[PDB]
Symmetry: C3
Subunit: 91 residues, 3 copies
């Protein structure tokens, strides 16, 4: 499992969201961030390793404009995920 | 050392906070997040490996309601922690 | 590559920012966080492994005051970085 964090232009949110739903990406967290100080959105998703590349492509395709400031995607390892409602774990 | 991030229902904050203090969990960071777009809180703590399971349980017990949307906990590795005040590593 | 997250006193931002520019640190993300509930800023940067220690020192030197609440720095692994504009990966 990997965490994928994407720093995108705020107005791209909808587009990106749509794409991620189309790839059956379920859980997803978004927070307001300042980068460059420009306002950006940070999207966080956690997916299986096999999905990573796929997801990246879609985000890229949805978040891209062609100009500097399109932002960036970071992939990092996740050891464990726990669903609070049930306490179910996957590793 | 592991980073523990929990995305919870905002109103659960107090409860969760209490529990974490009861387990001697000291440093803790909280930010507003939108998930699902519902308002959530993201809590971040960094603890020793041996504490991980314990902490998870408490968070679960404190943050749970029984309904969809209770949120999620992610555990990820941390290589290094540095205290800014002293530079201790 | 490593992600460096620093939780600092808000007013230190400028100082810290200057220092990071002086070490050629380019991309950098800042968000408002509540820690301890005191208002803090979380700075996130991703750098090559070889840079890590350097960066840490500068942040420390820039963010420090000597009192409790100076905050903390966490270093964690990053597997992959992708530039959205081009799709370039490292």
């Amino acid at each position: 499992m990997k965490k994928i964090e994407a720093i995108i232009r705020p107005f791209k949110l909808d587009e990106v969201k749509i794409a991620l739903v189309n790839a059956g990406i379920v859980g997803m967290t978004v927070s307001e961030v300042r980068g460059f100080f420009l306002q950006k959105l940070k999207l966080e998703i956690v997916v299986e390793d096999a999905q990573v590349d796929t997801v990246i492509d879609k985000i890229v395709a949805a978040a891209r404009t062609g100009e500097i400031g399109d932002g960036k995607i970071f992939v990092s390892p996740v050891d464990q995920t726990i669903r609070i409602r049930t306490g179910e774990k996957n590793a």
